[PDB]
């Protein structure tokens, strides 16, 4: 069949693939839409490969709870314009739903399941997209909190109603504890942190006997600051989260906080410089 603009339009409206990609695929396919779609599918793996080394530090955290089971998920892209795109969002939601349904905590299993969809998505969006990590939290009561798309939290609790769990999730999102209780910090870590603070205290000229007692104080502060129950409750900082829990006769048995692009170094851009480099 003849490769008219209207036939290209039909394929493009169906797929969202780039205009010239559609023209090329249809032409080789002799105008057969379905074969053209298969042609673009094979081509898309190579287009995606070309993008796969691009840093993708934007995107979304998503969370979903199913009774005693909850998933937290990071899916990355390059720009926040794409993070907001409906197609990207529907992809991330679809991955989220599958991880909950299948109770999938191995991110490589999730990757394999969605690699063809991911590639077709990258082939039409033109950014690297990556299913980066997934985790499950199990619990008696589960809750979540989304700080827009950039921070997601799951919390497992005992004896807490909806509102309490959500406020604790909000607290975790803001204050990023890495332990539940101060006594959860391992003896090894506390001893090392002690040596760190004592060295620092000594080189500032504090006599040993003074420095030791001050460092004992610093260790309490240290385990308090890195633990959920030792932290001042963000909504009422005159009390710790531990005190808040006690007042409601509740406990926290778990949490997970993901933040988009954690552990990916921020690339700085210099537009003016890049424009001047181009001129040559």
């Amino acid at each position: 069949a003849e490769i008219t603009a209207s036939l290209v339009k039909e394929l493009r409206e169906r797929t969202g693939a780039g205009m010239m990609d559609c023209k090329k695929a249809l032409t080789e396919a002799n105008g057969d839409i379905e074969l053209a779609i298969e042609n673009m599918r094979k081509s898309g793996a190579i287009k995606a490969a070309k993008k796969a080394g691009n840093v993708a530090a934007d995107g979304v955290i998503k969370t979903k709870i199913d009774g005693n089971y909850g998933i937290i998920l990071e899916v990355n892209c390059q720009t926040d314009f794409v993070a907001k795109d409906a197609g990207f969002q529907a992809f991330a939601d679809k991955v989220l739903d599958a991880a909950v349904a299948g109770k999938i905590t191995d991110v490589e299993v999730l990757k394999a399941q969605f690699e063809e969809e991911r590639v077709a998505l990258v082939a039409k969006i033109g950014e690297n997209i990556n299913i980066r990590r997934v985790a499950a939290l199990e619990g008696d009561v589960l809750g979540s909190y989304q700080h827009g798309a950039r921070i997601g939290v799951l919390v497992a609790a005992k004896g807490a109603d909806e509102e309490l769990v959500k406020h604790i999730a909000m607290h975790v999102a803001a204050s990023k504890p890495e332990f539940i209780k101060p006594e959860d910090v391992s003896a090894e870590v506390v001893e090392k942190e002690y040596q760190v603070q004592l060295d620092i205290a000594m080189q500032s000229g504090k006599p040993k006997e003074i420095a030791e007692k001050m460092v004992e104080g610093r260790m309490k502060k240290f385990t308090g600051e890195v633990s959920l129950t030792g932290q001042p409750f963000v909504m009422e900082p005159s009390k710790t989260v531990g005190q808040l829990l006690k007042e409601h006769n509740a406990e926290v048995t778990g949490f997970i906080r993901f933040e988009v692009g954690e552990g990916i170094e921020k690339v700085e851009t210099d537009f003016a410089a890049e424009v001047a480099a181009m001129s040559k």
Partner: protein, 363 residues
């Protein structure tokens, strides 16, 4: 002095924004002789930024970057609009960029006129879906890289784009041409019982004999300028950017206060409620260390004074962390003179902890 126009590029990461901007600077320098880039047409000086991030742009507009007078949407014709082109245009609507020009890139790689037309129609339709005038939008069919390589055909399309920057974006209005406004800083009385108010003329011109309104905080009053003073020296008018004293007919010292404005009658109104775009400083920028919540009750600093306000957060938003930018609706405890686009600081205990822009006056 040469009109100044703030423009920006927006579009997919590799559809050609940077290359285009380099082409604009190269071809204009070739044709007329000699972070952001700058370039000149014979009639206009341009400052040009890139808009790679939505939140980043919005935060820059809030913290002081000049608002775009017009944006250049860069789309490679080889692809046509991407799924996220919707989002590029939507940012444009959100910040109210007054004009969008389109540069279709890599047109040399689309040999088929009907396919270029398909792309063009898609872009017009997307623009009109966000109330830009799609049908009247200048669309240039160019090729940035080939222009940069000195191909005369494609250089001419760069000059076409620059002409549209010249023709399609109106010369921005200068402060001196706007209705007179002076933010009032101090208030004195002289001996002939003539009240004097001081400040830097923000815009326009105040001449002896002209009526003014005193607007904001209290019921609006009306007076007549009986004199303009510049460091004890008697002047016949005060102009935008000048530090002056304005002497007033009849109105008494106790009736005017700092934070009000002097204005050309009927040109600015007092308001209590508005929609705003706000940026809350991070800890490292000298701002709050901790989040606030729906009962946050800070001061909003407009021009020369603080006004306490309460806030409403967007649906679904329960918490604001240092470093966030969000929309909020503010209700001041008393009115202040304001228009869409008015910048303000957010303060607590007299310390600035955020910045914002009035996006829409409500009441």
């Amino acid at each position: 002095t040469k009109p100044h126009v703030n423009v920006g590029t927006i579009g997919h990461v590799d559809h050609g924004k940077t290359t285009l901007t380099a082409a604009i600077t190269t071809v204009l320098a070739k044709t007329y002789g000699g972070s952001h880039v700058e370039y000149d047409t014979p009639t206009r000086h341009y400052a040009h930024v890139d808009c790679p991030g939505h939140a980043d742009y919005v935060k820059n507009m809030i913290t002081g970057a000049a608002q775009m007078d017009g944006a250049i949407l860069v789309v490679a014709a080889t692809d046509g609009p991407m799924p996220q082109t919707r989002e590029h245009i939507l940012l444009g609507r959100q910040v109210g960029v007054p004009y969008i020009i389109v540069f279709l890139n890599k047109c040399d790689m689309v040999d088929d006129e009907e396919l270029l037309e398909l792309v063009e129609m898609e872009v017009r339709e997307l623009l009109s879906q966000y109330d830009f005038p799609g049908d009247d939008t200048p669309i240039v069919r160019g090729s940035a890289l080939k222009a940069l390589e000195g191909d005369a055909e494609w250089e001419a399309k760069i000059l076409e784009l620059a002409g549209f920057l010249d023709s399609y974006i109106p010369e921005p209005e200068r402060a001196i041409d706007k209705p007179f406004l002076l933010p009032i800083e101090d208030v004195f009385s002289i001996s002939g019982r003539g009240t004097v108010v001081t400040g830097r003329v923000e815009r326009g011109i105040i001449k002896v004999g002209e009526e003014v309104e005193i607007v904001g905080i209290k019921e609006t009053q009306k007076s007549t300028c009986t004199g303009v003073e510049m460091f004890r020296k008697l002047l016949d008018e005060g102009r935008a950017g000048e530090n002056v004293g304005v002497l007033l007919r009849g109105i008494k010292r106790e009736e005017i206060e700092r934070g009000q404005v002097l204005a050309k009658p009927g040109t600015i109104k007092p308001h209590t409620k508005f929609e705003s775009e706000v940026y809350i400083l991070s800890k490292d920028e000298g701002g709050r260390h901790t989040p606030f919540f729906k009962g946050y009750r800070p001061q909003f600093y407009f021009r020369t004074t603080d006004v306490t306000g309460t806030i409403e957060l967007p649906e679904g938003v329960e918490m604001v962390m240092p470093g966030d930018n969000i929309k909020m609706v503010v209700t001041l405890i008393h009115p202040i003179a304001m228009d869409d686009g008015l910048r303000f600081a957010i303060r607590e205990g007299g310390r600035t902890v955020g910045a914002g822009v009035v996006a829409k006056v409500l009441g």
